[PDB]
Amino acid sequence: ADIKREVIVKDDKAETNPKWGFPPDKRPIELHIQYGVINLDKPPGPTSHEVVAWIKRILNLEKAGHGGTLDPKVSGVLPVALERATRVVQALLPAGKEYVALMHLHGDVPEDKIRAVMKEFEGEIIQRTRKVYYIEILEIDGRDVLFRVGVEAGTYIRSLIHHIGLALGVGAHMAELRRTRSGPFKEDETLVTLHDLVDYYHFWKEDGIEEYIRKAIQPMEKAVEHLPKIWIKDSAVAAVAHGANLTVPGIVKLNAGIKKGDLVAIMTLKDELVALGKAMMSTQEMIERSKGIAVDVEKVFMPRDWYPKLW
């Protein structure tokens, strides 16, 4: 579920100060890292915590955090938010995930049966109740089944495989698991390894080449790409950056379909992430009304200095 949401403009005349802030992808290298997220390919073996610890050491960081814990033996997409953007991984909690898994059946089962049974596991499953968007069988060799599966956040693949084994009557074991997608993070040019990071950091710090480290780290905004957004005026950015909740008068435009309780991303007119919050009203109410709290801000990312309050 990552289909472009419709945008409804409340203030057609709103403009932004080019001197305040920065286009997300045009931030000075240090700032880029301070507000960056790494689309890391976690290696099997270490825990996610240990991997993050390594990243902090490699990039000489003070803080960092991962989104969606991958177990020790599991490899693949591991979003790691850095420094000031650390908490942006919260935007990934509800993100859907895709995995590639190797299932080992404990008894012989006809290929036709395996395909039919794994076709019925698409949809709601209970492990409590989660949704499996799709199960694509890549290869079947006797007792080994290699398949790709898209799932709702919080779905346990090991349990899914266990239930598939029960349905087949022979039982099954998850021999290997690799996450291929977490929300907006997938196996594309942005997927990097720990060795890549070590080398790119070297090219930057020793050779003065920031190009590679820059490409190896994405702006934190990448983490909220699948979230409903609310774009606000420069003045509202200052207020929110200083701890206030977002009020309706500060809204310029927003995505349709937002409803009270939803996790939303507050954005500047330059598409910079200001803060994550819980919508207090629906898109319609935000457009109709002219006052009141539109969002209860839970976490602010925007530093107070980018869109300063000037008295």
Partner 1 sequence: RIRKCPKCGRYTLKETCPVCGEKTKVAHPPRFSPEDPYGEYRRRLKRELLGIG
- Sequence letter at residue 11: D
Token match 């599991």: residue? 74
152 binds partner 1 (CB under 8 A): no
The least CB distance from residue 297 to partner 1, in Å, is 37
Q: Which residues contact 170 (CB under 8 A, 6 or more apart)?
A: 105, 106, 107, 108, 109
Q: Which residues contact 111 (CB under 8 A, 6 or more apart)?
A: 140
**190 vs 247, which CB is nearer to partner 1?**
190
Q: Which range touches partner 1 (CB under 8 A), out of 118-126, 172-180, 233-241, 281-289?
A: 172-180
Q: What is the DSSP letter of 39?
A: E
> What angle do helix axes 48-58 and 194-205 make, rounded to 10 degrees?
10
Question: Judged by CB under 8 A, which of 20, 133, 156, 203 binds partner 1?
Answer: 203
Question: Judged by CB under 8 A, which of 141, 291, 310, 311 binds partner 1?
Answer: 141
**12 vs 188, which CB is nearer to partner 1?**
188
Rounded-to-integer distance, Cα 198 and Cα 41, Å:
14
The least CB distance from residue 120 to partner 1, in Å, is 23
Residues touching partner 1, count (CB under 8 A): 33
53 binds partner 1 (CB under 8 A): no
The least CB distance from residue 87 to partner 1, in Å, is 25
Tell me whether residue 25 is one of the annotated catalytic residues.
no
Q: Which range touches partner 1 (CB under 8 A), out of 206-214, 273-281, 283-291, 301-309?
A: 206-214
Token match 């925007």: residue? 302
Q: Which range touches partner 1 (CB under 8 A), out of 37-45, 119-127, 230-238, 284-292?
A: 37-45
According to DSSP, the β-strands at 246-247 and 229-232 are unpaired
189 binds partner 1 (CB under 8 A): no
Q: Which range touches partner 1 (CB under 8 A), out of 1-9, 28-36, 40-48, 293-301?
A: 40-48
Residues 223-282 that bind partner 1 (CB under 8 A): none
The least CB distance from residue 68 to partner 1, in Å, is 17
66 binds partner 1 (CB under 8 A): no
Q: Which range touches partner 1 (CB under 8 A), out of 118-126, 141-149, 225-233, 273-281?
A: 141-149
Task: For CA atoms 101, 164, 67, 54, give the dihedral sign.
Answer: negative
131 binds partner 1 (CB under 8 A): no
Angle at 241 between CA 221 and CA 67, to 5 degrees: 35
List the beta strands (DSSP E) in the chain: 7-9, 36-42, 64-66, 75-82, 97-105, 123-126, 129-141, 144-151, 172-182, 185-186, 191-192, 218-219, 229-232, 246-247, 251-255, 263-268, 273-279, 293-300
209 binds partner 1 (CB under 8 A): yes
Rounded-to-integer distance, Cα 144 and Cα 173, Å:
10
46 binds partner 1 (CB under 8 A): yes
204 binds partner 1 (CB under 8 A): no
194 binds partner 1 (CB under 8 A): yes
Task: For CA atoms 268, 305, 33, 244, give the dihedral sign.
Answer: negative
212 binds partner 1 (CB under 8 A): yes
Q: Which residues are catalytic?
A: 71
